């Protein structure tokens, strides 16, 4: 852990980025046998 | 996302990062150059002479690997097999039905000069030879491949097979850490012999000298894990090879799957050269290795662990893969196969069961399930999370950096 | 599901995976080649000579297995049995009623040359022979088959039987781990003798020298587990062989069942060659092994464990089987047999219960269909009682070895 860096803002910025990548996975059918989920079929405050 | 600018001063930044290559190399895309596999037994002195050199060199840390190669070539032309059917591979026409072939019917040359001790280094050893000296020498290859105390395990075991049809004790001395005769594996010509012995006795599973495969076996599918964790995943989910593929849900696992499946490599062929692509020096980097298939490895192995594999508790956890998305993708797959069994009446006595919101799908279709997961916020339910917990809590003896110790830390708490 | 395409670029991928074979081999589909079982006792020196070679070679780690084979052949022609009835198998006509037959009336040849020490290697040993030397040598085969400290267990036990009719005692020296005389099991001709001895004395259970079967027994149904975990499942569920079959609920267990049951193998026959398909070298890979019947093994054994088998606590858990669906299928079967016991007047004194007097409450008997239907109704996802049932059957087991279907079960149900 380096010294003389801005710890609090740096970590929050990394929590946001970890929470992004962590909650919303990158699932998506890759293979099929003639049928496949055509994906793009809450209100508010639930994250992107 | 090709062009990145920096807001505060609106200049261009070009994110690049260090190179990295070494492509894999396939079997077929090799026999398109050379059409022979060269076995440089440089020298031919005398079988009897050689029988000695070793016998002694073996009670000492300096038997020359150029000598064992030669003793083996010497002791192994039991040209002792008849093809019931044809044999081909990658063009190379090994034989043709009815024929008689021997191990080294896979392309012998000879080369460079001065060998070590001369004449006859002890004349005492007799034709206790084809009987066991080879089997022992080949055996050693296997014992050499492992670093861990399980080595003197395979050795204890792997020395009772000579007792068979002949009988008498262990030769070396020193412990291992790759040093006593482990350099052996590094001799391009030693491997080509152990490979051709294993390959030969795979075809004639029935031979009397087929016993040799004791240490000659771990040559087959060397550096070929992935492409076989894959069959293990099929077996353990009861799914078809094609249905499993459909359940691949991340770019790399898919990329990697294509890589392994690229056609014209005889991976599915009965007795081909392919399994030995590494020890015959057909390939230096394997398309089928768990290191060029790190995501497909983490995925298939994590999934199989959740489905109760014991084999998988001790798989090693690749670095530089996308852990979170890969695991979720495997949880989903495990939870599918796990909750909805494949029950179904199989026998009857004239009578039989004619079988046919937010509660998860009925079967194991990749699409039904992918949709139910969409519905659930693409964020796993607390049951499928409880599922994972029951499959990992109550595991123990977990080595650091295995997908098992990874799973229990991630789900048991 | 034959053709798989990749959505993003719409190209074809062909999922294949490494080969794998070694078919099984059946008894019958063998006697259709050769019609004799060759016992290469290469050499015939002298019984007295041999009696010695061993007696000494036995107080030393280098008695030759070519010698014991010959001592045994030597000491074992008590052609000492009369068929009360006919004896046949796979065509091979062993004898015919009234007849007299002896152990090796199963096809002796001889071969290759130079044997070890010559003449008479100690003339001191007497006709303390047919009495016990053979029984001891045969006994050793059994002690050889096990790796675990239970070995010197069978040995202690398996040395008090010579005391019988002669009192004898121990001979070797070294521990085990397959080495002292365990290579013995690997001698294609040694096994053919122990197999013929066991088979012979199975037919004449009544003989005086029938005692030999002490170590000669574990030859019978060697590498034949599955096809006998199956009779254990029948016994423990009180069901019929045919009713049990109907409760098979997964493709492989069914595939595997067919495998074992394929006809013309005399598996059900009284005294046949089949049990010894392995040691007579009739078959190199057994259709009846728990390794070519991994699903049928996990299934039948897990099921019996839930039903209170002790035998099953320590069965080993095959790899590369479909664990989750197999276990659920066995829970269902266990829960069926378990809740709806077995209850039923059998005797009376002129009066007797004429028995046949809520939704979602499980079926009344043990019919595969009624139950399969009730499971459909339940979401094909086991109720919390049948799950409680499993818990009560595994909690309170202990001494559980790693990789047994028992340790599997307690980890899966106790928590």
UniProtKB/Swiss-Prot annotation, chain A:
Subcellular location(s) per record: Virion; Host cytoplasm
Domain of life according to the entry: Viruses
Function of the molecule: Encapsidates the genome in a ratio of one N per nine ribonucleotides, protecting it from nucleases. The encapsidated genomic RNA is termed the NC and serves as template for transcription and replication. The nucleocapsid is bullet-shaped with the tip containing 8 turns of a conical spiral before reaching the helical cylindrical trunk. Nucleocapsid assembly is concomitant with replication, therefore viral replication depends on the intracellular concentration of free N, termed N(0). All replicative products are resistant to nucleases.
Subunit-level organization: Homomultimerizes to form the nucleocapsid. Binds to viral genomic RNA; this interaction contributes to the virion assembly. N in the nucleocapsid interacts (via C-terminus) with the P protein (via C-terminus); this interaction allows to package the L polymerase in the virion and positions the polymerase on the template, since P acts as a bridge between N and L. N(0) interacts with the P protein; this interaction prevents the uncontrolled aggregation of N(0). Interacts with the matrix protein (inner layer); this interaction contributes to the virion assembly. Interacts with the L polymerase.
Family, per entry: Belongs to the vesiculovirus nucleocapsid protein family.
Protein name: Nucleoprotein
Taxonomic placement: Viruses, Riboviria, Orthornavirae, Negarnaviricota, Haploviricotina
Gene that specifies this protein: N
Shown residues in whole-protein numbering: 318 to 370 of 422
Curated annotation (Swiss-Prot), chain B:
Subunit architecture: Homomultimerizes to form the nucleocapsid. Binds to viral genomic RNA; this interaction contributes to the virion assembly. N in the nucleocapsid interacts (via C-terminus) with the P protein (via C-terminus); this interaction allows to package the L polymerase in the virion and positions the polymerase on the template, since P acts as a bridge between N and L. N(0) interacts with the P protein; this interaction prevents the uncontrolled aggregation of N(0). Interacts with the matrix protein (inner layer); this interaction contributes to the virion assembly. Interacts with the L polymerase.
The protein, known as: Nucleoprotein
Gene Ontology MF terms: RNA binding
Main location: virion
Binding-site list for RNA: 142, 151, 205, 213, 285, 316, 399
Xref: InterPro entries: Rhabdo_ncapsid (IPR000448), Rhabdovirus_ncapsid_C (IPR023331), Rhabdovirus_ncapsid_N (IPR023330), Rhabdovirus_nucleoprotein-like (IPR035961)
GO biological process terms held by the UniProt record: RNA replication; viral transcription
Swiss-Prot record, chain C:
Positions bound to RNA: 142, 151, 205, 213, 285, 316, 401
GO cellular component: helical viral capsid; host cell cytoplasm; ribonucleoprotein complex; viral nucleocapsid
Predominant cellular place of this UniProt entry's protein: virion
GO biological process per UniProt: RNA replication; viral transcription
Short name of one Pfam family: Rhabdo_ncap
Locations listed in the record: Virion; Host cytoplasm
Annotated keywords: Capsid protein, Helical capsid protein, Host cytoplasm, Ribonucleoprotein, RNA-binding, Viral nucleoprotein, Viral RNA replication, Virion
Region (Interaction with the phosphoprotein): 349-383
An example Gene Ontology molecular-function term: RNA binding
SUPFAM superfamilies listed in its UniProt record: Rhabdovirus nucleoprotein-like
Function field: Encapsidates the genome in a ratio of one N per nine ribonucleotides, protecting it from nucleases. The encapsidated genomic RNA is termed the NC and serves as template for transcription and replication. The nucleocapsid is bullet-shaped with the tip containing 8 turns of a conical spiral before reaching the helical cylindrical trunk. Nucleocapsid assembly is concomitant with replication, therefore viral replication depends on the intracellular concentration of free N, termed N(0). All replicative products are resistant to nucleases.
Complex formation: Homomultimerizes to form the nucleocapsid. Binds to viral genomic RNA; this interaction contributes to the virion assembly. N in the nucleocapsid interacts (via C-terminus) with the P protein (via C-terminus); this interaction allows to package the L polymerase in the virion and positions the polymerase on the template, since P acts as a bridge between N and L. N(0) interacts with the P protein; this interaction prevents the uncontrolled aggregation of N(0). Interacts with the matrix protein (inner layer); this interaction contributes to the virion assembly. Interacts with the L polymerase.
UniProt family annotation: Belongs to the vesiculovirus nucleocapsid protein family.
Protein name: Nucleoprotein
Organism: Vesicular stomatitis Indiana virus (strain San Juan)
Gene: N
């Amino acid at each position: 852990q380096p010294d003389d860096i801005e710890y609090t803002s740096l970590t929050t910025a990394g929590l946001l980025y970890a929470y992004a990548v962590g909650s919303s996975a990158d699932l998506a059918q890759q293979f099929c046998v003639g049928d496949n989920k055509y994906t793009p079929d809450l209100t508010t405050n639930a994250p992107p | 996302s090709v062009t990145v600018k920096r807001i505060i001063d609106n200049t261009v930044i070009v994110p690049k990062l260090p190179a990295n290559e070494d492509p894999v190399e396939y079997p077929a895309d090799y026999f398109r150059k050379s059409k022979e596999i060269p076995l440089y037994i440089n020298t031919t002195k005398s079988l009897s002479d050689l029988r000695g050199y070793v016998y002694q060199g073996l009670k000492s840390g300096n038997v020359s690997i150029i000598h064992v190669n030669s003793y083996l070539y010497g002791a192994l032309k039991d040209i002792r097999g008849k093809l019931d059917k044809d044999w081909s591979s990658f063009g190379i026409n090994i034989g043709k039905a009815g024929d008689t072939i021997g191990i080294f019917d896979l392309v012998s040359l000879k080369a460079l000069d001065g060998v070590l001790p001369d004449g006859v280094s002890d004349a005492s050893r007799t034709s206790a030879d084809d009987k066991w000296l080879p089997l022992y020498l080949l055996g050693l290859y296997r014992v050499g491949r492992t670093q861990m105390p399980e080595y003197r395990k395979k050795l204890m075991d792997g020395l009772t097979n000579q007792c068979k049809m002949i009988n008498e004790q262990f030769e070396p001395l020193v412990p291992e850490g790759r040093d006593i005769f482990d350099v052996w594996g590094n001799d391009s010509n030693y491997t080509k012999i152990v490979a051709a012995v294993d390959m030969f006795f795979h075809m004639f599973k029935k031979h009397e000298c087929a016993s040799f495969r004791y240490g000659t076996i771990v040559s087959r599918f060397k550096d070929c894990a992935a492409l076989a964790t894959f069959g293990h995943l099929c077996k353990i989910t009861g799914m078809s090879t094609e249905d499993v593929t459909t359940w691949i849900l991340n770019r790399e696992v898919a990329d990697e799957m294509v890589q392994m499946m690229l056609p014209g490599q005889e991976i599915d062929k009965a007795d081909s050269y392919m399994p030995y692509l590494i020890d015959f020096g057909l390939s230096s980097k394997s398309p089928y290795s768990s290191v060029k298939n790190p995501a497909f490895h983490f995925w298939g192995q994590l999934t199989a662990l959740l489905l109760r594999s014991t084999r998988a508790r001790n798989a090693r956890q690749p670095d530089d893969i996308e852990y979170t998305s890969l695991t979720t993708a495997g949880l989903l797959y495990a939870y599918a196969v796990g909750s909805s069994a494949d029950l179904a009446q199989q026998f009857c006595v004239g009578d039989n069961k004619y079988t046919p919101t937010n509660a998860p799908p009925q079967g194991r279709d990749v699409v039904e399930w992918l949709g139910w997961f969409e519905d659930q916020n693409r964020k796993p339910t607390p049951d499928m999370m409880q599922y994972a917990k029951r499959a990992v809590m109550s595991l123990q003896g977990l080595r650091e950096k295995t997908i098992g110790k990874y799973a229990k830390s991630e789900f048991d708490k």
